[PDB]
mmCIF file of all heavy atoms in Angstrom:
data_model
loop_
_atom_site.group_PDB
_atom_site.id
_atom_site.type_symbol
_atom_site.label_atom_id
_atom_site.label_comp_id
_atom_site.label_asym_id
_atom_site.label_seq_id
_atom_site.Cartn_x
_atom_site.Cartn_y
_atom_site.Cartn_z
ATOM 1 N N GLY A 1 144.163 112.846 -19.192
ATOM 2 C CA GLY A 1 143.096 113.499 -19.956
ATOM 3 C C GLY A 1 143.641 113.705 -21.345
ATOM 4 O O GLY A 1 144.546 112.987 -21.781
ATOM 5 N N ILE A 2 143.070 114.672 -22.032
ATOM 6 C CA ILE A 2 143.594 115.041 -23.308
ATOM 7 C C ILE A 2 145.085 115.361 -23.196
ATOM 8 O O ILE A 2 145.507 116.139 -22.342
ATOM 9 C CB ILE A 2 142.822 116.234 -23.912
ATOM 10 C CG1 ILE A 2 141.429 115.740 -24.350
ATOM 11 C CG2 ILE A 2 143.587 116.852 -25.061
ATOM 12 C CD1 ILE A 2 140.516 116.864 -24.837
ATOM 13 N N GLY A 3 145.854 114.756 -24.062
ATOM 14 C CA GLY A 3 147.311 114.998 -24.093
ATOM 15 C C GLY A 3 148.084 113.983 -23.262
ATOM 16 O O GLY A 3 149.317 114.013 -23.279
ATOM 17 N N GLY A 4 147.397 113.164 -22.495
ATOM 18 C CA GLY A 4 148.064 112.144 -21.722
ATOM 19 C C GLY A 4 147.994 112.342 -20.201
ATOM 20 O O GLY A 4 147.072 112.974 -19.727
ATOM 21 N N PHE A 5 148.971 111.805 -19.515
ATOM 22 C CA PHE A 5 148.958 111.778 -18.050
ATOM 23 C C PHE A 5 150.092 112.579 -17.428
ATOM 24 O O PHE A 5 151.152 112.749 -18.055
ATOM 25 C CB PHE A 5 149.109 110.325 -17.553
ATOM 26 C CG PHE A 5 147.864 109.547 -17.699
ATOM 27 C CD1 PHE A 5 147.397 109.180 -18.975
ATOM 28 C CD2 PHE A 5 147.103 109.182 -16.610
ATOM 29 C CE1 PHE A 5 146.212 108.469 -19.114
ATOM 30 C CE2 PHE A 5 145.925 108.454 -16.725
ATOM 31 C CZ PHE A 5 145.484 108.096 -18.005
ATOM 32 N N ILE A 6 149.864 113.060 -16.210
ATOM 33 C CA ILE A 6 150.972 113.615 -15.416
ATOM 34 C C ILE A 6 151.017 112.923 -14.053
ATOM 35 O O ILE A 6 150.008 112.422 -13.520
ATOM 36 C CB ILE A 6 150.834 115.139 -15.238
ATOM 37 C CG1 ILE A 6 149.572 115.502 -14.459
ATOM 38 C CG2 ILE A 6 150.929 115.813 -16.602
ATOM 39 C CD1 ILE A 6 149.532 116.943 -13.967
ATOM 40 N N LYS A 7 152.226 112.886 -13.495
ATOM 41 C CA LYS A 7 152.416 112.349 -12.144
ATOM 42 C C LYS A 7 152.316 113.483 -11.175
ATOM 43 O O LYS A 7 152.925 114.548 -11.355
ATOM 44 C CB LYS A 7 153.814 111.709 -12.058
ATOM 45 C CG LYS A 7 154.084 111.092 -10.707
ATOM 46 C CD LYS A 7 155.495 110.452 -10.733
ATOM 47 C CE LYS A 7 155.876 109.806 -9.362
ATOM 48 N NZ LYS A 7 157.302 109.361 -9.341
ATOM 49 N N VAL A 8 151.594 113.252 -10.069
ATOM 50 C CA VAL A 8 151.366 114.257 -9.024
ATOM 51 C C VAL A 8 151.624 113.657 -7.662
ATOM 52 O O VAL A 8 151.653 112.446 -7.495
ATOM 53 C CB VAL A 8 149.941 114.822 -9.071
ATOM 54 C CG1 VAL A 8 149.674 115.468 -10.429
ATOM 55 C CG2 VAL A 8 148.893 113.731 -8.861
ATOM 56 N N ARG A 9 151.829 114.523 -6.668
ATOM 57 C CA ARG A 9 151.927 114.107 -5.269
ATOM 58 C C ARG A 9 150.615 114.414 -4.605
ATOM 59 O O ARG A 9 150.153 115.549 -4.657
ATOM 60 C CB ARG A 9 153.069 114.798 -4.551
ATOM 61 C CG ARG A 9 154.415 114.688 -5.240
ATOM 62 C CD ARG A 9 155.574 115.210 -4.394
ATOM 63 N NE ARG A 9 155.361 116.530 -3.779
ATOM 64 C CZ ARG A 9 155.575 117.709 -4.349
ATOM 65 N NH1 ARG A 9 156.014 117.739 -5.598
ATOM 66 N NH2 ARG A 9 155.365 118.853 -3.689
ATOM 67 N N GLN A 10 150.011 113.412 -3.921
ATOM 68 C CA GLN A 10 148.744 113.601 -3.264
ATOM 69 C C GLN A 10 148.965 113.924 -1.781
ATOM 70 O O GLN A 10 149.487 113.117 -1.036
ATOM 71 C CB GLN A 10 147.886 112.338 -3.395
ATOM 72 C CG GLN A 10 146.564 112.475 -2.667
ATOM 73 C CD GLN A 10 145.751 111.181 -2.721
ATOM 74 O OE1 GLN A 10 145.886 110.419 -3.646
ATOM 75 N NE2 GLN A 10 144.901 110.987 -1.716
ATOM 76 N N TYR A 11 148.507 115.123 -1.385
ATOM 77 C CA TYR A 11 148.488 115.561 0.016
ATOM 78 C C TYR A 11 147.072 115.604 0.524
ATOM 79 O O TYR A 11 146.169 116.117 -0.176
ATOM 80 C CB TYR A 11 149.113 116.947 0.160
ATOM 81 C CG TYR A 11 150.585 117.031 -0.187
ATOM 82 C CD1 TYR A 11 151.001 117.215 -1.501
ATOM 83 C CD2 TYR A 11 151.578 116.953 0.795
ATOM 84 C CE1 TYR A 11 152.363 117.288 -1.819
ATOM 85 C CE2 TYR A 11 152.915 117.049 0.504
ATOM 86 C CZ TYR A 11 153.289 117.203 -0.816
ATOM 87 O OH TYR A 11 154.644 117.304 -1.129
ATOM 88 N N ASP A 12 146.849 115.104 1.730
ATOM 89 C CA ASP A 12 145.486 115.098 2.269
ATOM 90 C C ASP A 12 145.348 116.126 3.374
ATOM 91 O O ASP A 12 146.384 116.596 3.935
ATOM 92 C CB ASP A 12 145.122 113.699 2.796
ATOM 93 C CG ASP A 12 145.134 112.643 1.678
ATOM 94 O OD1 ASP A 12 144.713 112.985 0.570
ATOM 95 O OD2 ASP A 12 145.606 111.520 1.942
ATOM 96 N N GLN A 13 144.120 116.515 3.698
ATOM 97 C CA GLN A 13 143.831 117.405 4.832
ATOM 98 C C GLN A 13 144.620 118.723 4.715
ATOM 99 O O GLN A 13 145.227 119.183 5.664
ATOM 100 C CB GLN A 13 144.175 116.682 6.149
ATOM 101 C CG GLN A 13 143.332 115.430 6.353
ATOM 102 C CD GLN A 13 143.760 114.597 7.527
ATOM 103 O OE1 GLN A 13 143.459 114.942 8.682
ATOM 104 N NE2 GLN A 13 144.480 113.513 7.259
ATOM 105 N N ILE A 14 144.589 119.283 3.515
ATOM 106 C CA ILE A 14 145.205 120.573 3.254
ATOM 107 C C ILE A 14 144.084 121.656 3.354
ATOM 108 O O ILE A 14 143.007 121.450 2.786
ATOM 109 C CB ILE A 14 145.811 120.597 1.857
ATOM 110 C CG1 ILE A 14 146.943 119.522 1.769
ATOM 111 C CG2 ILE A 14 146.366 121.981 1.534
ATOM 112 C CD1 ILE A 14 148.088 119.769 2.700
ATOM 113 N N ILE A 15 144.401 122.768 4.021
ATOM 114 C CA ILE A 15 143.456 123.853 4.124
ATOM 115 C C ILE A 15 143.660 124.860 3.000
ATOM 116 O O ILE A 15 144.788 125.353 2.785
ATOM 117 C CB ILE A 15 143.549 124.559 5.446
ATOM 118 C CG1 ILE A 15 143.212 123.592 6.596
ATOM 119 C CG2 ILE A 15 142.628 125.791 5.491
ATOM 120 C CD1 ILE A 15 143.553 124.122 7.944
ATOM 121 N N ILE A 16 142.566 125.218 2.296
ATOM 122 C CA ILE A 16 142.623 126.228 1.237
ATOM 123 C C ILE A 16 141.568 127.319 1.519
ATOM 124 O O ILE A 16 140.462 127.017 1.908
ATOM 125 C CB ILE A 16 142.417 125.605 -0.174
ATOM 126 C CG1 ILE A 16 143.476 124.581 -0.503
ATOM 127 C CG2 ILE A 16 142.428 126.695 -1.272
ATOM 128 C CD1 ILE A 16 143.406 124.054 -1.917
ATOM 129 N N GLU A 17 141.959 128.565 1.272
ATOM 130 C CA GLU A 17 141.023 129.660 1.355
ATOM 131 C C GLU A 17 140.577 130.043 -0.048
ATOM 132 O O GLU A 17 141.438 130.382 -0.880
ATOM 133 C CB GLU A 17 141.636 130.862 2.055
ATOM 134 C CG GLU A 17 142.149 130.594 3.460
ATOM 135 C CD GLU A 17 142.773 131.806 4.104
ATOM 136 O OE1 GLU A 17 142.498 132.927 3.676
ATOM 137 O OE2 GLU A 17 143.542 131.615 5.087
ATOM 138 N N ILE A 18 139.277 130.013 -0.323
ATOM 139 C CA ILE A 18 138.743 130.325 -1.634
ATOM 140 C C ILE A 18 137.610 131.334 -1.498
ATOM 141 O O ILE A 18 136.566 130.975 -0.976
ATOM 142 C CB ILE A 18 138.193 129.053 -2.339
ATOM 143 C CG1 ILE A 18 139.197 127.907 -2.332
ATOM 144 C CG2 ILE A 18 137.769 129.370 -3.747
ATOM 145 C CD1 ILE A 18 138.596 126.593 -2.817
ATOM 146 N N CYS A 19 137.796 132.520 -2.008
ATOM 147 C CA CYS A 19 136.782 133.568 -1.933
ATOM 148 C C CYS A 19 136.201 133.699 -0.519
ATOM 149 O O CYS A 19 134.994 133.709 -0.347
ATOM 150 C CB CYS A 19 135.659 133.267 -2.942
ATOM 151 S SG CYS A 19 136.117 133.401 -4.690
ATOM 152 N N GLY A 20 137.091 133.748 0.478
ATOM 153 C CA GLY A 20 136.668 133.925 1.869
ATOM 154 C C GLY A 20 136.151 132.685 2.524
ATOM 155 O O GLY A 20 135.868 132.652 3.731
ATOM 156 N N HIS A 21 135.986 131.614 1.754
ATOM 157 C CA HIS A 21 135.559 130.299 2.332
ATOM 158 C C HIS A 21 136.824 129.482 2.643
ATOM 159 O O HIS A 21 137.636 129.244 1.765
ATOM 160 C CB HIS A 21 134.708 129.547 1.323
ATOM 161 C CG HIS A 21 133.352 130.121 1.115
ATOM 162 N ND1 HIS A 21 132.192 129.607 1.695
ATOM 163 C CD2 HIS A 21 132.914 131.167 0.342
ATOM 164 C CE1 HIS A 21 131.158 130.317 1.307
ATOM 165 N NE2 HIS A 21 131.575 131.255 0.475
ATOM 166 N N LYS A 22 136.943 129.057 3.904
ATOM 167 C CA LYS A 22 137.938 128.053 4.259
ATOM 168 C C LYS A 22 137.415 126.648 3.987
ATOM 169 O O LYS A 22 136.269 126.318 4.328
ATOM 170 C CB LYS A 22 138.375 128.186 5.724
ATOM 171 C CG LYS A 22 139.704 128.897 5.891
ATOM 172 C CD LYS A 22 140.077 128.941 7.356
ATOM 173 C CE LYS A 22 141.349 129.771 7.555
ATOM 174 N NZ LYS A 22 141.605 130.012 8.999
ATOM 175 N N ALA A 23 138.227 125.817 3.338
ATOM 176 C CA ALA A 23 137.847 124.441 3.042
ATOM 177 C C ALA A 23 139.026 123.539 3.218
ATOM 178 O O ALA A 23 140.161 123.947 2.993
ATOM 179 C CB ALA A 23 137.267 124.335 1.664
ATOM 180 N N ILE A 24 138.769 122.268 3.532
ATOM 181 C CA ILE A 24 139.818 121.286 3.714
ATOM 182 C C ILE A 24 139.630 120.104 2.797
ATOM 183 O O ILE A 24 138.524 119.631 2.594
ATOM 184 C CB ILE A 24 139.962 120.874 5.211
ATOM 185 C CG1 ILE A 24 141.328 120.208 5.449
ATOM 186 C CG2 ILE A 24 138.814 119.974 5.631
ATOM 187 C CD1 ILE A 24 141.662 120.117 6.952
ATOM 188 N N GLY A 25 140.750 119.624 2.202
ATOM 189 C CA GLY A 25 140.629 118.473 1.347
ATOM 190 C C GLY A 25 141.957 118.054 0.780
ATOM 191 O O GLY A 25 143.010 118.500 1.253
ATOM 192 N N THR A 26 141.904 117.113 -0.184
ATOM 193 C CA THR A 26 143.104 116.626 -0.805
ATOM 194 C C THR A 26 143.563 117.590 -1.879
ATOM 195 O O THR A 26 142.766 118.192 -2.611
ATOM 196 C CB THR A 26 142.816 115.228 -1.411
ATOM 197 O OG1 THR A 26 142.551 114.340 -0.350
ATOM 198 C CG2 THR A 26 144.016 114.721 -2.237
ATOM 199 N N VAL A 27 144.898 117.738 -2.018
ATOM 200 C CA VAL A 27 145.484 118.541 -3.063
ATOM 201 C C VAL A 27 146.513 117.694 -3.799
ATOM 202 O O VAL A 27 147.360 117.104 -3.132
ATOM 203 C CB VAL A 27 146.086 119.852 -2.582
ATOM 204 C CG1 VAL A 27 146.783 120.628 -3.681
ATOM 205 C CG2 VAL A 27 144.983 120.706 -1.921
ATOM 206 N N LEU A 28 146.430 117.693 -5.096
ATOM 207 C CA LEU A 28 147.455 116.997 -5.920
ATOM 208 C C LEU A 28 148.413 118.061 -6.424
ATOM 209 O O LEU A 28 147.992 119.122 -6.972
ATOM 210 C CB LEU A 28 146.767 116.344 -7.127
ATOM 211 C CG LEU A 28 145.590 115.412 -6.784
ATOM 212 C CD1 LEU A 28 145.071 114.739 -8.025
ATOM 213 C CD2 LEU A 28 145.994 114.425 -5.700
ATOM 214 N N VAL A 29 149.719 117.823 -6.255
ATOM 215 C CA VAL A 29 150.690 118.843 -6.670
ATOM 216 C C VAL A 29 151.559 118.220 -7.784
ATOM 217 O O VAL A 29 152.049 117.135 -7.684
ATOM 218 C CB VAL A 29 151.607 119.206 -5.494
ATOM 219 C CG1 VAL A 29 152.703 120.164 -5.956
ATOM 220 C CG2 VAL A 29 150.765 119.849 -4.371
ATOM 221 N N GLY A 30 151.718 118.985 -8.861
ATOM 222 C CA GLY A 30 152.474 118.492 -10.020
ATOM 223 C C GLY A 30 152.447 119.439 -11.178
ATOM 224 O O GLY A 30 151.929 120.565 -11.040
ATOM 225 N N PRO A 31 152.907 119.006 -12.342
ATOM 226 C CA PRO A 31 153.123 119.902 -13.484
ATOM 227 C C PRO A 31 151.846 120.118 -14.306
ATOM 228 O O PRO A 31 151.783 119.885 -15.533
ATOM 229 C CB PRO A 31 154.178 119.194 -14.302
ATOM 230 C CG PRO A 31 153.901 117.689 -14.039
ATOM 231 C CD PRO A 31 153.488 117.661 -12.573
ATOM 232 N N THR A 32 150.803 120.625 -13.666
ATOM 233 C CA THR A 32 149.557 120.967 -14.347
ATOM 234 C C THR A 32 149.763 122.301 -15.028
ATOM 235 O O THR A 32 150.349 123.233 -14.465
ATOM 236 C CB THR A 32 148.366 121.038 -13.372
ATOM 237 O OG1 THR A 32 147.226 121.516 -14.066
ATOM 238 C CG2 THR A 32 148.659 121.933 -12.179
ATOM 239 N N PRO A 33 149.265 122.464 -16.254
ATOM 240 C CA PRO A 33 149.398 123.729 -16.987
ATOM 241 C C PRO A 33 148.613 124.852 -16.340
ATOM 242 O O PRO A 33 148.957 126.028 -16.569
ATOM 243 C CB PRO A 33 148.848 123.412 -18.368
ATOM 244 C CG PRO A 33 148.788 121.921 -18.482
ATOM 245 C CD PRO A 33 148.617 121.408 -17.063
ATOM 246 N N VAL A 34 147.575 124.525 -15.582
ATOM 247 C CA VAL A 34 146.704 125.520 -14.911
ATOM 248 C C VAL A 34 146.345 125.023 -13.510
ATOM 249 O O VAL A 34 146.033 123.815 -13.337
ATOM 250 C CB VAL A 34 145.434 125.728 -15.776
ATOM 251 C CG1 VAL A 34 144.386 126.566 -15.023
ATOM 252 C CG2 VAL A 34 145.758 126.334 -17.140
ATOM 253 N N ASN A 35 146.378 125.879 -12.508
ATOM 254 C CA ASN A 35 145.901 125.471 -11.175
ATOM 255 C C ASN A 35 144.393 125.289 -11.234
ATOM 256 O O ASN A 35 143.696 126.155 -11.761
ATOM 257 C CB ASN A 35 146.208 126.551 -10.145
ATOM 258 C CG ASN A 35 147.698 126.820 -9.996
ATOM 259 O OD1 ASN A 35 148.488 125.892 -10.103
ATOM 260 N ND2 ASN A 35 148.051 128.059 -9.777
ATOM 261 N N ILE A 36 143.913 124.173 -10.712
ATOM 262 C CA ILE A 36 142.484 123.924 -10.787
ATOM 263 C C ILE A 36 141.902 123.547 -9.425
ATOM 264 O O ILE A 36 142.507 122.817 -8.619
ATOM 265 C CB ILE A 36 142.073 122.937 -11.862
ATOM 266 C CG1 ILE A 36 142.644 121.554 -11.619
ATOM 267 C CG2 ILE A 36 142.448 123.432 -13.255
ATOM 268 C CD1 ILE A 36 142.191 120.500 -12.599
ATOM 269 N N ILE A 37 140.746 124.072 -9.146
ATOM 270 C CA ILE A 37 139.958 123.728 -7.967
ATOM 271 C C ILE A 37 138.900 122.718 -8.431
ATOM 272 O O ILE A 37 138.027 123.027 -9.246
ATOM 273 C CB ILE A 37 139.264 124.945 -7.350
ATOM 274 C CG1 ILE A 37 140.296 126.052 -7.058
ATOM 275 C CG2 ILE A 37 138.471 124.590 -6.121
ATOM 276 C CD1 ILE A 37 141.382 125.609 -6.135
ATOM 277 N N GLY A 38 139.047 121.484 -7.953
ATOM 278 C CA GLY A 38 138.178 120.415 -8.413
ATOM 279 C C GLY A 38 136.982 120.180 -7.502
ATOM 280 O O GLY A 38 136.808 120.869 -6.492
#
């Protein structure tokens, strides 16, 4: 995106709890300046 690219590790079928909602999906892990829920 703006500023270029980062390399991340893609994990699938990860469970996340968000505001009391449990959800499952892919999570990319890497040097993002901010954690983001996509």
Side-chain angles (χ1 to χ4, degrees):
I2 288 176
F5 284 70
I6 63 168
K7 182 179 179 188
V8 300
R9 305 190 312 275
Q10 179 184 331
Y11 295 84
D12 298 321
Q13 300 171 78
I14 299 297
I15 298 168
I16 300 187
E17 301 180 20
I18 308 171
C19 292
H21 290 259
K22 259 183 185 170
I24 197 165
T26 294
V27 175
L28 308 185
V29 175
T32 174
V34 171
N35 298 325
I36 63 176
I37 305 302

